[PDB]
Amino acid sequence: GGFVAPNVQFSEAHWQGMEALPLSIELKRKLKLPLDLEGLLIDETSLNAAVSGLLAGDVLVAINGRKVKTLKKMQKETRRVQMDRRASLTVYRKGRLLTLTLSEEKNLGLAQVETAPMILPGDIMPHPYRGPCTQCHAIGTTGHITPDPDGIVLPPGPIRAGAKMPHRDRGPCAACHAIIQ
Amino acid sequence: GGFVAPNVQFSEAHWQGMEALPLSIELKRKLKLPLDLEGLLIDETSLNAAVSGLLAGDVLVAINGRKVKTLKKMQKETRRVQMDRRASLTVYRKGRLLTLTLSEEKNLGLAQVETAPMILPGDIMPHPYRGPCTQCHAIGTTGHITPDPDGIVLPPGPIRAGAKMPHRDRGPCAACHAIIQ
């Protein structure tokens, strides 16, 4: 269960703590950004990228002065300076073109890319239409991990009589727990 | 709005198309895996990692023969062979220790790491208890991108009278669209 189209494109890149995604018209209108703007959207920053001053909602225009309008082009670029400890960040925020340094005490490394997750034939589109489905998704059931862990509930599990309450008052110990005597 | 604890750990790594996450007791019991098992869980495989034979639900025990039980240790490891085009994959699947080659025609690169997303003071835990919150999450409102794009609706937008229907029959053109005459 894994049919992939001959052109599955990249949905995102992760690099020194920033998640980067193509800046679509969907997203440009959704975040009320100018529609001439070319670059990558940064929607999630942690660790080294957040440290460098980089916030979410920011658009990644360039690195080291070279323009990055696509993921493919942004990767190419991280490969170039992957062994460096610093690269420059040209960013678009609130109409200002800011600059930032990104840092790492070993080396920056290559930004790794992702496609949209593999989906089921009968699956429901949770987002506005964007084009034929095989264009971003692989169709099938592998690349799974289904049922998704997060939707599995754990039986709270046996407790000796007079156990100590780790959690808030939730009700009679006997409703959720199997008691031991 | 960004208070981080002096020990924010890694939640995941992405490497040549696999998303890797610490294999917790939560996840070990949730996927009915042996509880002695040490390694990383692989929950999402695409591109180069899926190509190498790697499926989701798989646990990443080792690379090139070196054991990887934590993210920190798995990164260290990708740094080592980051310039190589091939590394070995020791994996745990259904009780079998399989082996796989991972490949890339330029170079593999460094696996990039992520922490749990920054959360709000008043935010609700969507998962079983796991320990104090500052241990995985940064508390605040930056690293935002809120409101989250996905929860913004776009007004379908004006259509000239006699426009052609791109989408299924949804009802009277006048309910959603502003018509032009």
Ligand code: HEC
């Ligand atoms: C056309 C008929 C479809 C169907 C049935 C689906 N998609 Fe997509 N999809 C894309 C990206 C980048 C995401 C992540 C979320 C986002 O940023 O908007 C998604 C998400 C989904 C889901 C949720 C998947 C999950 O694991 O929860 C599902 C069920 C889904 N899609 C089905 C990317 C694209 C495209 C990129 C240009 C196109 C075209 C489509 N999707 C179209 C469809």
Ligand code: HEC
């Ligand atoms: C203790 C009081 C809390 C609160 C309020 C939250 N967390 Fe966590 N969290 C962790 C990871 C790895 C995730 C991703 C999902 C997963 O794999 O299970 C999450 C998710 C959340 C969310 C959803 C966030 C989102 O962007 O949608 C929220 C609101 C949230 N958490 C709040 C990691 C951990 C831990 C790691 C050991 C611990 C401890 C906690 N979380 C505890 C809390």
Ligand code: HEC
């Ligand atoms: C469901 C409505 C519950 C009621 C009522 C009670 N408990 Fe509970 N408990 C429940 C769950 C789902 C869990 C898992 C952890 C979590 O996220 O809350 C627990 C946990 C405990 C523990 C720790 C378990 C462990 O590490 O093995 C103990 C010792 C415990 N609970 C005891 C307890 C007592 C004494 C209660 C009533 C006076 C009680 N629980 C209520 C679910 C529910």
Ligand code: HEC
């Ligand atoms: C809501 C209940 C709707 C009804 C009824 C109709 N339309 Fe629609 N339309 C709607 C949305 C949210 C969108 C965005 C794209 C999507 O994911 O479906 C659209 C799209 C169109 C388009 C393309 C828009 C563009 O690219 O500019 C056209 C030309 C269009 N719709 C026309 C149309 C006609 C003629 C309808 C009734 C006979 C009609 N729509 C119904 C929402 C809804």
